[PDB]
């Protein structure tokens with residue numbers, strides 16, 4: 001989120017770094033093929 | 049230190065998972081810092097209430113003798129021996145392995161055949177806690193998971209509410225009218241339910257309000273649809289369609 | 292500065308980029324500007340978390 | 341006389357080298373450079389805070 | 390990553406999978422044996438999927454029922470045996486692999502490189518009207534395709550149809566069934582559109598079975614791609630297709646010669662017991678089914 | 681009778697089988713091939 | 729360029745697509761028997777796709 005929105009929280013990645021405690025983990029994004037690529041701000045474009 | 053301490057005394061009674069032990073500990077430390085007048089204090093106090101309220105290990109004990117299930121089933125539904133025989137086999141194969149085991153199941157037939165009544169009869173047969181939950185025509189997946197708790201008006205998803213109400217760690221959920229579930233393009237809950245109904249992923253169910261995983265593994269979901277075919281194929285394929 | 296100090300001894304162990312070090316320094320300056328009980332203090336303290 | 345603003349546009353198949361020329365101009369004139377993607381944007385607040 | 394051959398799943402799951410679930414119920418093998426025969430029977434019945442996840446769910450359910458028989462039930466040590474298993478998980482549902490066996494005329498098996506794994510979906514056809522609507526009649530014996538057709542299937546169908554009409558007239562003039570009769574044809578869905586044409590080589594043999602009226606030679610799965618003049622072309626993703634054919638008990642298969650390369654990548658156990666027939670021109674196939 | 685399309689293919693199939701069954705049984709009759717016929721299936725059956 | 733012998737009734741055609749340009753082929757074919765009636769007078773209707 002922006003962190004100024006009510007109830008805002010950081011994207012999933014910030015949580016994986018928070019949990020795994022290493023700076024250089026092995027992230028495993030799952031099921032990339034069916035990512036929702038919409039007009040509402042495409043995360044699949046955001047992934048680049 | 050009063051709300052915190054009644055959360056503490058129940059913590060002495062119910063054994064929260066160690067991750068929930070920690071989370072409730074940091075939130076408890078947060079509670080004293082806040083003003084009673086602060087706006088976030090209300091949502092986080094109610095959040096900790098919602099978190100501590102959940103049973104964590106409270107275990108209504110089951111009967112495990114088949115016989116008592118025999119009797120109590122015959123007392124309140126004449127005939128319809130087939131479904132009694134099948135459900136007896138299901139609990140027989142559940143006890144065959146040892147402990148209870150999950151599986152999803154479905155009932156279907158003409159409306160008013162007695163479906164829900166036998167459902168509850170099993171809840172008092174097995175001795176597990178009951179809670180019906182119709183889901184016909186919904187599409188707001190947020191109801192199954194609440195809202196972020198940072199959204200205005202957020203409250204935890206329905207499942208957490210049933211755990212707070214039934215107060216056991218292992219109740220008998222009864223989803224109703226699966227056939228008419230609102231399965232749309234607007235965020236299909238029916239895809240969202242798969243994380244619920246997966247025998248393994250319920251053990252770490254999470255909802256947008258309180259992120260921490262819950263452990264539903266002992267729950268006994270049930271589903272009722274007037275006709276079993278309308279249900280989307282990936283969902284229909286898991287549970288058996290008893291008739 | 293209790294939270295600030297536990298996170299700062301943290302900061303001393305994990306080798307933060309110096310850019311992010313100074314950026315959390317100005318942000319911590321703002322946290323000093325921010326109130327001890329404000330709900331935004333909770334959002335930004337859990338941000339610090 | 342003085343420096344002047346002007347608008348310009350480039351267009352063509354993706355990956356023809358567009359952004360790279362942008363920066364080459366930025367170090368040509370010596371002005372400071374700053375990319376700003378707006379693909380798929382809807383936040384008018386981004387244009388006005 | 391590929392799928393897994395049916396027999397191969399036993400050697401995987403018996404080591405890297407079964408012990409895990411055994412550690413999930415907290416038992417040791419000394420008190421909770423599960424023979425190889427119970428697992429091969431399982432995979433034979435309730436899960437015909439190249440992945441092992443479905444067998445993992447089955448064995449999970451069975452195990453948890455065993456746990457229920459321990460923790461509250463009677464036995465202190467459940468002893469699964471293959472004859473016992475149907476108790477725990479109920480009666481077998483599927484049994485009749487390869488539904489038809491004599492394959493009565495105008496229905497033929499066909500491999501398809503579906504969106505996940507591969508499956509040997511049958512294609513079926515039949516007459517839909519009486520043929521001698523007019524002894525002098527000169528109307529095309531129109532086909533009618535069905536089964537969630539993609540438009541590419543429409544061109545493929547007409548291509549294969551015309552090739553049938555030419556092969557008959559070049560081969561057996563006395564028959565006139567095709568040009569003088571309507572025919573319904575149904576391709577069951579499941580193939581992804583990009584692989585769609587690969588089923589086409591099956592199609593023409595379907596119609597021909599109706600034409601001469603003899604049943605096709607038994608359990609002869611095939612695949613390929615037709616050229617409208619009897620030349621054949623390579624198809625893709627062969628390994629999934631071949632493992633699905635192995636799962637179905639197939640004991641012969643026919644592929645374009647251009648795919649002689651990829652097929653040799655396969656593990657040797659996969660290739661035992663088959664008898665492949667690479668081919669280029671279509672006429673070859675005609676003499677390996679009927680005569 | 682408020683037909684689903686699947687019933688349409690089934691119906692024409694059964695129709696053609698009728699057309700064959702007469703001539704296979706009693707060729708002298710020709711009632712089916714020589715007359716129009718309305719046929720009505722009451723709705724109510726679920727499509728499957 | 730997939731076809732090389734270009735069997736009758738297929739022709740190459742350039743196209744200024746949204747990105748770059750591509751040499752898409754155009755194809756056509758019969759859809760019904762041609763001699764439906766030696767006296768037949770029905771417009772040979774096209775079907776674009």
Ligand SMILES: Nc1ncnc2c1ncn2[C@@H]1O[C@H](COP(=O)(O)OP(=O)(O)O)[C@@H](O)[C@H]1O
Nearest residue numbers: 124125126127128159160161162163164165166
């Ligand atoms: N065998 C039976 N014995 C007693 N009551 C029955 C029986 N079958 C149906 N009923 C009654 O019919 C009603 C049907 O309700 P229920 O199964 O609870 O939901 P639904 O109305 O959707 O079937 C209940 O009031 C139940 O008591």
Ligand SMILES: Nc1ncnc2c1ncn2[C@@H]1O[C@H](COP(=O)(O)OP(=O)(O)O)[C@@H](O)[C@H]1O
Nearest residue numbers: 350352353354355356357358359360361362363
């Ligand atoms: N004439 C060129 N000289 C140098 N680099 C080029 C040229 N044309 C294309 N490129 C390369 O194309 C890539 C992308 O170019 P650019 O326009 O900057 O982004 P995009 O093309 O993705 O919009 C760069 O990595 C750049 O090196």
